[PDB]
């Protein structure tokens, strides 16, 4: 309303800029997003009188914006030379600069403003001055460039010629990296202008063995340019070092052959390039360049690269060996030897991404499934049980998403390890796989995605038994539809049974069972109870996966036995105090379980020495008291024939009483006696 009123200095309606400071407006007010003044914005705009009128009323031409720039320094851009006259007698130093080191003179140069450049020249502008930025852009070797180097790279060949001859400029000045004006010139895409500037620079003495980005020489920048005349112009100078290399060990001539440039290559041999830094007749061969193989005849490397994968090892050693073009950071070969699996689109192949072994999922460049795989992958880099995502690269027609390379599918993994477990033993491996999937899906959901198609083909296991989620091309952002989360939790129900039964029941058999059949298929009570909570997670999913990680399904056998004994040691169970708080949680009001008359179901010998004191009753309390008492003494020397008949006590009590830990868990679940549960 107030100072925003002289938005009118932008409308260039000067009667509204005249009048509305007539009522009072701070011509030096600076909007502080970027610090522009009316007097700044007038010179960028180039107006005789919008400038003169603000000058007319005390607006100072040296106030700086965020960039650090003056109305003088930006007046070097517009190139208007008595806009510079109207504010020349108001400038302390004609070589004032902005925060990045730019003087009025240096910016007449980058914008080709020739009349501006000579007016500032004979009023004391330093043509040779290097740019002085802040120290955080100096400890990375920026700054130090001259006016000459930006007249160079921007192609102002008119502005360049005047600097070397009329203005004394320093041709072989370097910037803080070491580049001279020369390398700036050969980064200009304009072929004509790049040719003219470099001939002007060279004949005044630019060092032609400087280096630039990539450690390339000027000659290597000419070759990668595919430009015949710069290669010959540069070699016309007889101190050129032909066999110099970039950071990657390639000489100019090696690239000359690689990129199928016959005559470019022919002159660098004719001028002393090395015929021995690589296999150069092999490269011209595979480039179908008959005339260049022909001439290269008339005038090896041992190999370490270890793949980390064992299954894919020998296929990836081979792909390291063969020559392939790069698709970005990615080396790939569509061939059946490197094929991992078939997709609806493109399949998945092996790969080398920045020399790391990867799996490559190939999508068509437009495909919706691809864009949906990538976004979800991008929200999951913090999810430790999602396959690591290295990055995408597209060849303009086909998108390659590159992922951490794994060894086996969950289904393959369960097959290869079906025989490692004694029939009569604890399945720790099932708990590990399934707990990783709970976390993986839990984190996926907190990140706002639902997978929508989990099944053992999408679950990956790597060289060290980690399990990973993969294949997110059917995923959805679930915020717009929060009840769709429930399909991930039914699939998890199916997978809990899939893994507990060790792969014996195919996943597709399960996908055709009703919920109630799969529950009956559960082998034990912990498992049936867990699956139930995955099929009925509530209109209240929230984060039901995290709490289930505390289910007794995930308790070891030692932990289960420990909890049963620790409850059994509470004071009121040993004294059989039925009005206690613990006994009223476990057995209030009067059956129907596997441990009613539990005294009946343990063998009569073991029952008799436990009555080395009335006696034990058909109480759940007394059965926990029992477990505690035998727990503390099963190993003592008087009781070796007890120990022999019980077997391992944890297994004994669980298989004789299948529902017991689930019952105790259920009764103590949200009570102080939770403290006896194992740590989660």
Ligand X SMILES: Nc1ncnc2c1ncn2[C@@H]1O[C@H](COP(=O)(O)O[C@@H]2[C@H](O)[C@@H](COP(=O)(O)O[C@@H]3[C@H](O)[C@@H](COP(=O)(O)O)O[C@H]3n3cnc4c(N)ncnc43)O[C@H]2n2cnc3c(N)ncnc32)[C@@H](O)[C@H]1O
State the DSSP string of 264-327.
HHHHHHTTT--S-SS-HHHHHHHTT-HHHHHHHHT---------S-SSSHHHHHHHHHS---EE
Nearest distance from C-beta of residue 185 to a second copy, angstroms: 14
Residues 103-132 that bind ligand 27K (CB under 6 A): none
Select the span of 22-30, 139-147, 429-437, 490-498 touching ligand X (CB under 6 A). Answer: 139-147
**CA–CA separation, 65 and 44 (whole Å):** 13
Pairing status of strand 348-353 against strand 330-331: antiparallel
Q: For the window 263-292, what string marks contact with ligand X as x by the rule CB under 6 A?
A: ----------------------xx-x----
CA angle 203, 209, 212 (to 5 degrees): 110
- Choose the contact partner of 570 out of a second copy, ligand 27K, ligand X, none; CB within 5 to 8 A by kind: a second copy
Cα-Cα-Cα-Cα torsion 532, 538, 541, 547, nearest 10 degrees, comes to -50
**Cβ contacts of residue 160 below 8 Å, gap of 6+?**
148, 151, 152, 197, 200, 201
**Measured from the CB atom, is 31 or 632 closer to ligand X?**
31
Q: Identify whether the C-beta of residue 567 lies closer than 8 Å to the C-beta of residue 668.
A: yes
Q: Identify whether the C-beta of residue 196 lies closer than 8 Å to the C-beta of residue 157.
A: yes
Cα-Cα-Cα-Cα torsion 518, 521, 522, 525, nearest 10 degrees, comes to 100
Nearest distance from C-beta of residue 334 to ligand 27K, angstroms: 16
Q: Identify whether the C-beta of residue 374 lies closer than 8 Å to the C-beta of residue 449.
A: no
**Measured from the CB atom, is 74 or 201 closer to ligand X?**
74
Residues 411-430 that bind ligand 27K (CB under 6 A): 412
Q: How many CB atoms lie within 10 A of CB 636?
A: 10
Strands annotated E in 118-242 = none
Using CB under 6 A, which of 42, 169, 197, 387 touches ligand 27K? Answer: 387
Q: Identify whether the C-beta of residue 624 lies closer than 8 Å to the C-beta of residue 567.
A: yes
Q: For the window 446-475, what string marks contact with ligand 27K as x by the rule CB under 6 A?
A: --------------x---------xx----
Residues 586-605 that bind ligand 27K (CB under 6 A): none
**Measured from the CB atom, is 27 or 406 closer to a second copy?**
406
Using CB under 6 A, which of 142, 226, 533, 562 touches ligand X? Answer: 142
Select the span of 20-28, 261-269, 525-533, 633-641 touching a second copy (CB under 8 A). Answer: 633-641
Nearest distance from C-beta of residue 314 to ligand X, angstroms: 19
Report CA-CA distances (Å) from 367 to 402, 473, 561.
16, 10, 54
- Choose the contact partner of 342 out of ligand 27K, ligand X, a second copy, none; CB within 5 to 8 A by kind: a second copy
Partner residues linked to 398 by β-bridges: 364
Residues 304-333 that bind ligand X (CB under 6 A): 323, 333
Partner residues linked to 116 by β-bridges: none
- Choose the contact partner of 236 out of ligand 27K, ligand X, a second copy, none; CB within 5 to 8 A by kind: none
Report CA-CA distances (Å) from 460 to 463, 563, 572.
10, 34, 49
Using CB under 8 A, which of 37, 78, 436, 458 touches a second copy? Answer: 78
Select the span of 74-82, 403-411, 427-435, 481-489 touching ligand 27K (CB under 6 A). Answer: 403-411
**CA–CA separation, 252 and 229 (whole Å):** 15
Q: Note the residues at the interface with a second copy (CB under 8 A).
A: 11, 44-46, 66, 74, 77-78, 111, 136-137, 139-142, 177, 187, 212-213, 215, 285, 288, 290-291, 293, 297, 334-335, 339, 342-347, 354, 356, 362-367, 378, 381-382, 384, 388, 390-391, 394, 396-398, 404, 462, 556, 558, 569-571, 574-575, 632, 635-637, 679
Which residues are at the interface with ligand X (CB under 6 A)?
31, 34, 36, 41, 44, 65, 67, 69, 98, 100, 102, 107, 110, 131, 142-143, 145, 285-286, 288, 323, 333-334, 397
Give me the residues that bind ligand 27K (CB under 6 A), please: 340-341, 348, 359, 361, 387, 403, 405-409, 412, 460, 470-471
């Amino acid at each position: 309303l107030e100072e925003m009123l002289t938005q009118a200095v932008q409308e260039a309606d000067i009667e509204q800029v005249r009048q509305l400071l007539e009522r009072g407006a701070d011509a030096n007010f600076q909007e502080e997003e970027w610090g522009w003044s009316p007097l700044h914005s007038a010179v960028q705009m180039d107006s005789e009188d919008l400038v003169a009128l603000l000058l007319k009323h005390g607006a100072d031409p040296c106030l700086r914006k965020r960039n650090g720039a003056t109305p003088f320094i930006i007046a070097g851009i517009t190139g208007n030379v008595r806009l510079l006259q109207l504010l020349l007698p108001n400038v302390e130093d004609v070589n004032e600069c902005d925060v990045n080191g730019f003087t009025a003179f240096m910016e007449a140069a980058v914008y080709g403003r020739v009349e501006a450049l000579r007016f500032l020249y004979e009023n004391g502008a330093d043509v040779n001055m290097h740019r002085k930025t802040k120290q955080d852009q100096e400890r990375i070797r920026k700054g130090g460039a001259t006016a000459l180097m930006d007249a160079a790279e921007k192609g102002h060949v008119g502005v360049v010629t005047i600097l070397l001859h009329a203005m004394k400029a320093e041709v072989d000045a370097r910037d803080n990296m070491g580049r001279n004006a020369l390398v700036y010139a050969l980064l200009n895409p304009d072929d004509g202008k790049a040719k003219a500037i470099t001939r002007l620079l060279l004949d005044h003495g630019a060092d032609v063995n400087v280096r630039g980005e990539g450690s390339k020489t000027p000659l290597i920048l000419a070759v990668e340019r595919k430009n015949l005349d710069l290669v010959q112009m540069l070699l016309e100078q007889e101190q050129i070092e032909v066999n110099d290399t970039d950071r990657e060990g390639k000489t100019a001539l090696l690239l000359a052959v690689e990129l199928r440039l016959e005559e470019i290559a022919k002159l660098l041999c004719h001028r002393g390039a090395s015929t021995n830094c690589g296999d150069l007749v092999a490269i011209a061969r595979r480039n179908y360049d008959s005339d260049l193989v022909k001439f290269l005849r008339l005038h090896p490397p041992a190999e370490n690269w270890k793949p980390q994968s064992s299954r894919w090892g020998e296929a990836l050693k081979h792909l390291h060996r063969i020559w392939r073009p790069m698709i970005g950071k990615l080396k790939i070969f569509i061939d059946e030897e490197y094929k991992i699996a078939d997709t609806a689109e493109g399949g998945i192949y092996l790969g080398l991404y920045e020399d790391q072994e990867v799996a490559v999922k190939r999508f068509s460049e437009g495909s919706t499934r691809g864009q949906q795989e990538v976004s979800c992958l991008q929200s999951s880099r913090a999810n430790d049980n999602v396959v690591t995502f290295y990055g995408s690269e597209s060849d303009g027609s086909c998108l390659h998403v590159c992922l951490a390379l794994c060894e086996y599918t969950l289904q393959e993994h369960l097959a290869n390890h079906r025989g490692d477990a004694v029939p009569n033993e604890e399945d720790e491996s099932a708990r590990n796989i399934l707990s990783s999937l709970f976390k993986a899906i839990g984190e996926l959901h907190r990140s706002g995605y639902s997978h929508q198609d989990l099944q053992p083909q999408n679950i990956l296991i790597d060289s060290k038994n980690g399990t990973f989620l993969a294949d997110f091309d059917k995923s959805i952002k679930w915020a717009e539809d929060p009840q769709k989360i429930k399909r991930d939790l039914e699939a998890l129900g199916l997978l809990v049974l899939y893994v507990v039964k060790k792969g014996d029941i195919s996943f597709e058999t399960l996908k055709n069972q009703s919920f109630e059949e799969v529950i009956q298929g559960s082998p034990d009570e912990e498992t049936r109870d867990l699956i139930h909570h995955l099929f009925h997670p509530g209109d209240n999913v929230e984060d039901r996966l995290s709490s289930l990680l505390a289910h007794p399904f995930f308790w070891s056998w030692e932990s289960r036995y420990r909890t049963l004994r620790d409850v059994g040691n509470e004071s009121d169970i040993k004294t059989r105090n039925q009005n206690s708080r613990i006994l009223q949680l476990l057995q209030p009001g009067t059956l129907s379980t596997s441990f009613a008359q539990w005294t009946t179901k343990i063998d009569s010998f073991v029952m008799e020495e436990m009555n080395a004191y009335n006696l034990y009753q058909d109480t759940l309390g007394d059965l926990l008291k029992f477990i505690r008492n035998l727990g503390e003494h099963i190993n003592e020397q008087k009781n070796k024939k007890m120990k022999s008949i019980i077997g391992e006590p944890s297994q004994y009590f669980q298989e004789k009483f299948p529902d017991l830990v689930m019952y105790v868990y259920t009764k103590l679940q949200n009570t102080e006696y939770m403290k006896h549960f194992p740590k989660t």
